[PDB]
Design a protein around this nucleic acid. Structure first.
Lengths: 36, 426, 426, 36
DNA sequence: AAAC
DNA sequence: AAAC
DNA sequence: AAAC
DNA sequence: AAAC
């Protein structure tokens, strides 16, 4: 259960850079080979 | 054939971007992740909170609350879910609630409305449970709609109205608080012993009225505890609170030199520590943006209710410590207060609270998030925030009153086979 | 008036004697203590367990199980209870179930039947919950009677029948275990990929059949957990198990010199460590006395089912590890077995188990607690113990088959005012 | 939750001696005075 | 008489 | 439920 | 191609 | 629910 709040992240906003988590794992896409 | 009977738990990256927008006092879903029994969930939401451009420079920070709740499906489908799990593979598929035909009519659940117009009932019901257990005033009736299509376009698109931050007027005692209690006495005697008893019963009443309207509270009162399963309540996993701010933009042309526009950019971070999911459910994350309830016409109770009696002005502790709740009207604390709109206050409350002062020069001045006329309506309409009270505060934009761009870093330690275990027959 | 609004938690001595008696495989309530939310409960049951005098000397110890469960009232009155607590003082009084007009017809609940013939529904319902979640075979249907008056005199007076200790015949695979599974194939092709899938589904079936018939088990399988509130199950607080013994009494008159009577006196102690009661409920303590299921006519499967095939005699691991459950009859393992009574056994079970041997000289010899004829009836009638199978074992007495004299030391750390706070008006 | 069983209390049975718990507390009976 |  |  |  |  919930508690301390913290959006008080002192900083100027940064443009969203990348929708891929923090820790990844196994492979997810199979397309027949490499695709850039 | 032999099949791939197991799986080994490994980290699943369910991270995603969030492009959000809402109104001021409405609770809106900004992210949802369906969880499986036995997985471990963790999230790091980091983004920026922006308000629509305001008409003049910054004057007051707004406060932001971000919440993450867990709602087990059992909680939503009850018996039906239990049976589904037991039945297994041939279980009858789960019920789906109905939405109104519009793209934003399921937006309160942080989702685009499918063309078919239906969504999983757990998504709609979980929201109601969250609202009814932590956001409505304890004394208002639960929200009991069967399908999202029963909602107005503002509830459906922007989320349900939340209450204002507590005030003398914003947080009055519950509506039915009794101001007196009769003991039916006989004509020329009273039973000294019954009287005693009379007091014991009222006590018990009084406590349920003021602090225990909810079953879970009545038990804590006994010094016992109740699981979230005991009363079916969504479990609050994490909550972050913050004040959003920014800076003013100085105009510099011939006509707007001396003029400013407040720019609220607020970097925030919502972190949910690892969480073990005991049974299949959804993890709901919601946002609520609010301003302190500053009205441009609230008066100090002693300055607006006539002639002052000894009871009102002296601060006599024996009086305040011993008389019934005082019933007051919206007119005792507001310049255009409806004398017909009453509320019960604690005696001496006026000495425990101080309203903010807004000089009359600011009354209809656009660009300040102040409430311009005193809320008119029943107790419930006055405590529930009305987003239009803030319309004259901002520049008119397509992204409502606040917008956020977040990166939901979410890791789930789940146990399902690999995407290829999955696409390989052998 | 000012009233005695608080109380300070202090130890409450709820100790009492227990004079008990029951039949052999029936579950009976020997003590019950109603608990309040927030109290702490602890108990030390110490007494002696006696069997009725037996016809000859001791031959086999019986095993004794003592159990203490906690059943919250919410679990029993559901919604009604929740509302009662909230309503408080003027709540509508709780429902009362109906008993049969006899002094021992509520004995299964460890109580004397009141003259009015009714008891608190929580006392009757709690018992059913305990039975249905831990004592019936997973695959038998729940006991769903609305009032104790629907029970036979043996269920009502002595408690419900429990299952025998596991055997090849006493613990067969669940009744509906499938011995085959069809995949509807096309006329001159089979889908290699569908077949694969076919196997994945059966797997899921098979597990629910053999280990997960109960919702709570299906979840553990996922590696999740489920609270006792999740499926409404009585919580097992403590369990003691023991073997009762005693000594033989040597006869010494002209005619009974060479004759003995086994006297089973067994000192036992059932200790429940402190327990925090989260919500109001009953604390049920039950006893079950049983003998290992020794039949006087069980045969070794290989010795009683005809000619032996390679599959039955060789112990070939590839065979046993790969063929369907084997359907057998009561006649393959018993001298007067009904060939019409079937059961599903694991292939190779006969190499994983060994029956006890009773020489035929003992067949109808009274004084041995042996089962004399093989249980006849459906699977359910054969696994549920039948107390009459033990009648010819004991001397005939008014105290049934076993009797116990115990001292229930029980301390509850509750918080209610003192007996005099209580009788003093001021 | 339940666990180890222990009626294995090695001993000859003893007649029940007293129905009053192990730890008592406040006074329970008020009869107007002392009564033996 | 587990007592201001 | 002596479990990928 | 998070592979006996 | 700044609680005998």
């Amino acid at each position: 259960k919930g508690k301390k709040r913290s959006g008080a992240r002192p900083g100027r906003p940064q443009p969203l850079r990348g929708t891929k988590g923090k820790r990844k794992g196994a492979r997810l896409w199979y397309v027949g080979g490499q695709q850039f | 054939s032999n099949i791939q009977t197991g799986a080994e738990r490994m980290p699943h990256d369910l991270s995603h971007l969030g492009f959000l927008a809402g109104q001021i006092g409405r609770l809106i879903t900004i992210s949802t992740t369906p969880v499986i029994a036995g997985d471990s969930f963790e999230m790091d939401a980091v983004g920026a909170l922006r308000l629509s451009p305001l008409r003049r420079g910054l004057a007051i920070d707004s406060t932001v609350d971000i919440f993450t709740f867990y709602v087990p499906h059992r909680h939503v489908y009850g018996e039906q879910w239990i049976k589904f799990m037991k039945d297994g593979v041939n279980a009858t598929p789960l019920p789906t609630v109905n939405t109104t035909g519009y793209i934003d009519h399921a937006a309160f659940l942080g989702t685009i409305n499918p063309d078919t117009n239906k969504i999983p009932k757990h998504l709609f019901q979980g929201y109601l449970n969250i609202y009814n257990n932590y956001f409505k005033a304890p004394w208002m009736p639960d929200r009991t709609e069967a399908n999202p299509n029963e909602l107005n376009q503002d509830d459906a698109r922007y989320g349900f109205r939340c209450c204002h931050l507590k005030n003398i007027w914003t947080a009055p005692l519950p509506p039915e608080t009794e101001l007196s209690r009769q003991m039916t006495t006989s004509t020329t005697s009273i039973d000294i012993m019954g009287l005693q008893a009379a007091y014991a019963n009222l006590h018990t009443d009084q406590e349920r009225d003021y602090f225990m309207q909810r079953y879970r509270d009545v038990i804590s009162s006994f010094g016992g505890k109740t699981s979230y399963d005991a009363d079916n309540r969504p479990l609050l996993v994490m909550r972050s609170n913050l004040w959003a701010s920014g800076y003013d933009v100085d105009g510099t042309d011939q006509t707007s030199l001396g003029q400013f526009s407040g720019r609220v950019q607020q970097t925030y971070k919502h972190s949910v520590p690892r969480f073990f999911v005991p049974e299949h459910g959804t993890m709901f994350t919601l946002a609520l943006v609010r301003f302190p309830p500053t009205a441009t016409k609230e008066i100090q109770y002693l300055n607006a209710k006539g002639a002052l009696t000894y009871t009102d002005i002296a601060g006599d502790p024996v009086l305040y410590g011993n008389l019934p709740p005082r019933e007051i009207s919206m007119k005792d604390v507001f310049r255009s207060g409806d004398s017909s709109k009453k509320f019960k206050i604690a005696e001496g409350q006026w000495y425990r609270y101080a309203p903010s002062y807004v000089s009359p020069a600011y009354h209809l001045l656009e660009g300040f998030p102040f409430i311009q006329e005193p809320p008119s309506g029943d107790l419930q309409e006055r405590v529930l925030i009305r987003h239009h009270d803030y319309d004259q505060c901002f520049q008119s934009v397509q992204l409502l009153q606040w917008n956020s761009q977040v990166k939901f870093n979410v890791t789930v330690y789940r146990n399902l086979p690999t995407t290829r275990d999955s696409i390989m027959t052998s």
